[PDB]
Symmetry: C5
Subunit: 258 residues, 5 copies
């Protein structure tokens, strides 16, 4: 059993660790028309991803029998729920009451994979104009009204950290044979966030046949996104997405393959 | 041994045409000004999705007293695109400089895997609704009285047309569907937040009490679903639209011998 | 040998007449102006549904010291018609150009399968209510005092008439019902969203801790339920109506020898 | 092997007199105008319910170094009367011509089965409350200081009087209760909807980790509970009353040999 | 099979048992600017922690084989949910209605370990100016915008009661090999609190290899925080954190180890 640890930082829009709003989005702006809907880069949450390099197993990749790393299980943890207990920051308040803590829509997902997470493109609006330096369904097909449902042409891989927006991309259930993904979504404008944390819980990654993800290229592929909802600064009614970092501890073993 | 079949079924929220700019939503919902004048346009209601997937022919010769049928053993299913509701920059209602108000309200989730069409039982919130011609509704199969507000045993149909059987008039019939497995949940309210989980690690077993999965008559696999996520509100108004999401099915099939 | 019995029980929400245009609803709920003049009309309250299903006669002679009884071993039950609550185009209250306000409020779900009528315990929110002629209420079996607001052990009855025992005055008696299995849940509030799951894949075992299911006295299967989904609000005003839904039962029975 | 004991415990919501017209409720709750003049009348607070059920004498001679004790091995418990909260026609607050506002607010549920009185730990929201004469409160057993707002280890008592130990000053003591099993849940809020499940099909095992149930000292079985459902608001005003419900217990016991 | 039991009092800001607001914070003040955000120490909740001394097991610590106390299981309980059923105190009310009970954000965590709990620094705002005598990320590292996500340098041990604020410190999932920790968080301004209590539930502390926390220096390390939400006195709209005490009953055995 080989243990691999990693923390993936949230990519909430302010993805630069020198910027004072790191781990939040920039203030979210809202379209004045369907056809003029143009969100800046910094105002949308992204999938976080990392390829962790694994020890080289085959001193010759020509042999018809090889060793590949198998992900057998994962302990994962969203850290920092405790930060949202801060209600003395410069936040909206009612009379002399506490600062209004982060609330709204929540999006939790992690994936452990032997290759990049397969993504399927889908959108709330076909008419959105995404900025430059983002991978969105437009990058791979003709975005029509079909993208508001299932357009089987809208396929991609999560290979760039902080560049694939959650709002255009779902884990593709029709692929991801070599990846396990898990997520949940809870909507609403002001819904309270919920989180549980413990170091006592292991997720088994073996499939129906006892085969974990197999790490192509001696690469272990971690993906996630942990939106806690919106923060509101005491400066106004403008809101920012707030995300938290995710810990991964993956257990691997060597598996012989043809 | 095990044959994998997969399919995506797209939502039928009333804008059922993939050329239309509001595909995957209803048209703006209108409300009756009287019980007796209640006439929903067909583009303003959500429908059951359904697809008959053709399977490989198993029997060269149908004279044979022993034949093979495809047996649905398990299904991995997945409502895709909960992530799209994290879009709050679209042209939506907002409070001051706050984010766009996301999709909220009543949720209706249902899926079925069968070896024939899903059996439906007619039931309505109002017996006085006038449905457009071209929809299959309780009127289509029996005389509609007040009885339809409860259980009218004569109001039986089969889900045999995609995007034409409205959810508001049809429930899966639990007194039939011997050769289908169905699963659903409903959460009401006007502004209830939507909830969804997704994973590719979860298999639902379709074998009945006797270890028999759905058996695919005519070498067809019958998939059906509806996935209403609630109501969208465009920043043009207070008019609301149903929002649905597509559903993946990956059904595990094996060959089952049957006496002919 | 497993014999199957299936039945639908229609809700008794107050409009218990299948010819009435508000069947499956209550009449408009009125509210007392004083604790001492609290007089609810029969049509304004939800009732327990119940039905005795006749079973095949088993014993040609009842003198015999060994007899067969039908034993209920399991049940598949389903509340039908959650899909009807996805109708928001009816003549209903609305906010601006938004959808009709769907059914919301207090929910009460219960089902029972027994070999005799459900045992009831009388209990009331107010001892001063004056119930109308035609209903079976604690006053029918005992002297009603303030004790009826807690547990009055005199307030005993059997659920032997469909749509005449108001839910508001009768609980399933946990001190009796040796020969019945009952199940239920309650969720209060004025505007709480209703919740429902449905499937044809879930069986409830009726065998007690001794391996014995309900034994059908007089070759009768006793089915009981109530399925209050909340209150409907017509677009004519702020007046509200209870809304209930029908329940399906599929009971698996076997013959069980008994000593007499 | 098994002896069955059954009992109902009525709620002690502050109107603890079965001849009072508000039995099963509190009197109208009053609120302090200062921390230092906070004086709740006894009828305005809910209490623990308790009862000792006598059990057959097993030991004719108490000098014997081997004796039998009754061991509680399991319990079926039920909160009765959630159905009564479906009454929305009583003289209750209402919005326009809507139904009466049903019971909502904070819920506190607890039950305990023990071979002696339940051990209580004193703890308070305010150390400055002045409790009326005739109640057992932390003041009865120790010096009440600000320590009582957290854990004051000197604030120890035994639930030995029905309707006299206010729930707001007393927790089940997890440092004692070796010879008791207790279970509870709390759900706060001013207007939270109440939730209840009921069934006669569920048994809770009372055996500890070493397979030992409560052992009935003095051949008594000690039942305790509290079942606050929230607040009732009469149509007379905005004054509220605690509303509680009775709890049924059915305890299974066996004889166990012990060493004196 | 040895039994340890302890009550840990909450450290909600009024950490002083002589103070009339023991078990609550002082009234919470809110920053008027990101850069002047200075929380007085009495207005934040802290981790509670204690070290329970255990019997000495080894005469000679030089030996290559020794006995350590092993934590196999714990019964834990938050006490005092019943106190929140008091709606007659001097509290906000609507008309002649009951006092508004404690509502808002809840934070529950407990930990049982063979050494102090490992903490990872993380903040909602890198710009907060923490008062004197608290241990906060800046106490151990260079605080920058990195502290708003995961800064690997922000590492500490929960070694002082009522001095590590919950809003700066998460249990570190990358350490705590010799600790089990459990927690849950539920946000919102007015969310109803929820609590279950029973004496019938045991949590197993053995890891995947069947080993519990092993008590270094014959000390058992208990950590917790139990914030129930905010109280609002009838004097105004000013709020106080409200916390509750936590009971621990830890079962220990002797385990032989290779030194
Ligand atoms: C549950 C109850 O007591 N209902 C009353 C009802 C309501 O109080 C009222 O409709 C408000 O919702 O009042 C009823 O009519 C009454 C007459 O019988 C009486 O002569 O005059 C009363 C005037 O206060 C009152 O209108 C009704 O609507 O049916 C009687 C019913 O029992
Ligand atoms: C919990 C508490 O202290 N209750 C008080 C109560 C309330 O403060 C009041 O009803 C508002 O809800 O006040 C009581 O009556 C008091 C008199 O005894 C006193 O002489 O004058 C007071 C006026 O400032 C007040 O009316 C009451 O209603 O019973 C006493 C109770 O302890
Ligand atoms: C968390 C924080 O920054 N708290 C401030 C506090 C609050 O901003 C204020 O009470 C609103 O809730 O302000 C404190 O006092 C301040 C003075 O130090 C200053 O001279 O003037 C300030 C306003 O301009 C304010 O009065 C306080 O109330 O304790 C200080 C605290 O850090
Ligand atoms: C999603 C979207 O279309 N955003 C646009 C916003 C908003 O319309 C307004 O800020 C109202 O929130 O306007 C801009 O001028 C801006 O501030 O950058 C352009 C930006 O593209
Ligand atoms: C469900 C229903 O009856 N809708 C009817 C609507 C609504 O009453 C109004 O638009 C108010 O919402 O009125 C129409 O003229 C319309 O707009 O198409 C006819 C339609 O039959």
């Amino acid at each position: 059993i080989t243990q691999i640890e990693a923390f993936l930082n949230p990519r909430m829009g302010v993805n630069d660790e020198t910027n004072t709003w790191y781990g939040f989005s920039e203030q979210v702006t809202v379209a004045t028309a369907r056809e003029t809907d143009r969100p800046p880069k910094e105002q949308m949450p992204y999938y976080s991803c990392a390829r962790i390099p694994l020890p080289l197993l085959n001193e010759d990749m020509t042999c018809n029998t090889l060793l590949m790393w198998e992900a057998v299980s994962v302990k994962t943890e969203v850290i920092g729920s405790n930060t949202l207990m801060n209600v003395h920051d410069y936040m909206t308040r009612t009379d002399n009451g506490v600062g209004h803590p982060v609330v709204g829509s929540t999006y939790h997902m992690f994936a452990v994979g032997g290759e990049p997470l397969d993504l399927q493109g889908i959108q709330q609006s076909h008419l959105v104009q995404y900025p430059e330096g983002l991978i969105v369904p437009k990058s791979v097909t003709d975005v029509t009204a079909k993208i508001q449902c299932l357009d089987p042409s809208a396929k991609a891989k999560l290979d760039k950290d902080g560049k694939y927006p959650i709002e255009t991309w779902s884990p593709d259930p029709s692929r991801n044979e070599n990846t396990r993904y898990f997520g949940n979504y809870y909507g609403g404008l002001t819904t309270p966030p919920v989180l549980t944390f413990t170091n006592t819980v292991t997720t088994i990654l073996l499939d129906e046949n006892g085969v974990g993800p197999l790490c192509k290229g001696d690469g272990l592929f971690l993906s996630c996104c942990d939106v806690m909802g919106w923060f509101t600064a005491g400066s106004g009614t403008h809101q920012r997405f707030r995300g938290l970092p995710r810990y991964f501890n993956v257990q691997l073993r060597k598996r012989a393959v043809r």
